[PDB]
Design a protein around this ligand. Structure first.
Ligand SMILES: *[C@@H]1O[C@H](CO)[C@@H](O[C@@H]2O[C@H](CO)[C@@H](O[C@@H]3O[C@H](CO)[C@@H](O)[C@H](O[C@H]4O[C@H](CO[C@H]5O[C@H](CO)[C@@H](O)[C@H](O)[C@@H]5O)[C@@H](O)[C@H](O)[C@@H]4O[C@H]4O[C@H](CO)[C@@H](O)[C@H](O)[C@@H]4O)[C@@H]3O)[C@H](O)[C@H]2NC(C)=O)[C@H](O)[C@H]1NC(C)=O
Ligand SMILES: *[C@@H]1O[C@H](CO)[C@@H](O[C@@H]2O[C@H](CO)[C@@H](O[C@@H]3O[C@H](CO[C@H]4O[C@H](CO)[C@@H](O)[C@H](O)[C@@H]4O)[C@@H](O)[C@H](O)[C@@H]3O)[C@H](O)[C@H]2NC(C)=O)[C@H](O)[C@H]1NC(C)=O
Length: 333
């Protein structure tokens, strides 16, 4: 018997990535998978991938051992940074949060860029975005969940633990919201373009006044798969100066003197402190403090795009409300 809580416990790897276990096939084949609101496919290493080290060192899906496996074979290609992942589609049963999602299309990977995925603790990615941005326009896991009636509410939500010393890395809830992990109300903004979890954002404040560049209305995406913030160079440039910044972007030891950065979502200020937006790769005084604000210029018909990753979704409990097409943020506890 498999039903029906919808809870997934998340592992936190040095605040950089969050992953949980899913099962594919019967009998189930277990994979560590990042839950990613920025992409829409499910993919895992395949037994048919013999030229990439990542597939060889990670657990691999074997269709010959699944009695529910149904061949497809449609090829697909997904760019990850400079390289890419490549594979073909298959169908099988997927168990996420003890919900058995029947006939799920997913990608068996044939090749993986070893620079990103060789030393990953996770094996795959479970995409939680919309169908429009799936490689083969596959029906995403969450849509099948909704379609099979496996959830009481048409929302899913994230608690990401930012304290890497604790034992709970985080928690992802399919079909509800865990009231233990936020305080006060969520602020809800509607989805502006449907493929991405995308909404309208206001002006970005450095210290107490305006960056000007987003005061006319920017676009932004909640992407559980990214750690760092990414936004237009025109704003990132100003942030770099007010912080003392110099591949990456460095400083340190002046964190407490830096200003808070604040995003204006739903006519409210969501503030991020230096402690929350500076990443610390070291530990002592040979430590390396790195800025989480990376420059990235992508257009959309709604304006230049901000990516708000785990550094934002950590302090701000995030609800993805599919039934009302809206995203909500609340102060996390
Ligand atoms: C190899 O894989 C690729 C990648 O997936 C296949 O190419 C894609 O296949 C999908 C699925 O057929 C295509 O999406 C559909 O497009 C339809 C036309 O827009 C649309 O009606 C579909 O939306 C409905 O269904 C989903 C749920 O899908 C169920 O049924 C399919 C059948 O295979 C399964 O794949 C799923 O697991 C699931 O069982 C709902 O979420 C959606 O809201 C729609 O639901 C209506 O219909 C349901 C009954 O069908 C009913 O239950 C609902 O209440 C509602 O009335 C879906 O978007 C996609 O277009 C296609 N890609 C391309 C580029 O064409 C490829 O076909 C496959 N190849 C082989 C050889 O198998
Ligand atoms: C945190 O968020 C909460 C929202 O989730 C806030 O509480 C809500 O506040 C609004 C506005 O004050 C209330 O909405 C109004 O309620 C009246 C009366 O509702 C009653 O009658 C209707 C039938 O007409 C019935 O369906 C209801 O069940 C009630 O019996 C409506 O007529 C108005 O049009 C309007 O919707 C919400 O009711 C209220 N919700 C809750 C759960 O309290 C809360 O104030 C926020 N807190 C802070 C600090 O901002």
């Amino acid at each position: 018997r498999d039903s029906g809580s919808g809870i997934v416990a998340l592992t936190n790897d040095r605040d950089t990535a969050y992953y949980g276990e899913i099962g594919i096939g019967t009998p189930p084949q277990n994979f560590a998978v990042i839950f990613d609101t920025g992409s829409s496919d499910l993919w895992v290493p395949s037994t048919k991938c013999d030229t990439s080290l990542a597939c060889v060192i990670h657990p691999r899906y074997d269709s010959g051992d699944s009695s529910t496996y149904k061949g497809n074979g449609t090829t697909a290609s997904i760019q990850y940074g400079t390289g890419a992942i490549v594979g073909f589609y298959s169908q099988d049963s997927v168990e996420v949060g003890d919900l058995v999602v029947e006939h799920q299309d997913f990608i068996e990977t044939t090749e993986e860029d070893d620079t990103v995925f060789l030393k990953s603790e996770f094996d795959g990615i479970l995409g939680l975005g919309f169908q429009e941005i799936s490689a083969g326009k596959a029906v995403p896991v969450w849509y099948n969940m909704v379609n099979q009636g496996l959830v009481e509410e048409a929302v899913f939500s994230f608690w990401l633990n930012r304290n890497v010393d604790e034992e709970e890395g985080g928690e992802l809830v399919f079909g509800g919201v865990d009231p233990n992990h936020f305080r006060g109300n969520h602020t809800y903004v509607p989805v502006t373009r449907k493929g991405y979890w995308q909404f309208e954002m206001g002006d970005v404040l450095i210290g107490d006044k305006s960056s000007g560049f987003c005061a006319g209305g920017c676009a932004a995406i909640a992407d559980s798969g990214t750690s760092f913030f990414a936004g237009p160079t025109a704003i990132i440039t100003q942030i770099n100066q007010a912080i003392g910044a110099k591949e990456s972007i460095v400083d340190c030891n002046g964190i407490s003197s830096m200003p808070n950065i604040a995003f204006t979502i739903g006519s409210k200020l969501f503030e991020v402190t230096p402690e929350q937006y500076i990443y610390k790769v070291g530990e002592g005084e040979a430590a390396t403090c790195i800025s989480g604000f990376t420059a990235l210029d992508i257009m959309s018909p709604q304006g230049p795009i901000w990516i708000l990753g785990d550094m934002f979704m950590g302090p701000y409990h995030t609800v993805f409300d599919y039934g009302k097409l809206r995203v909500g943020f609340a102060e996390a506890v």
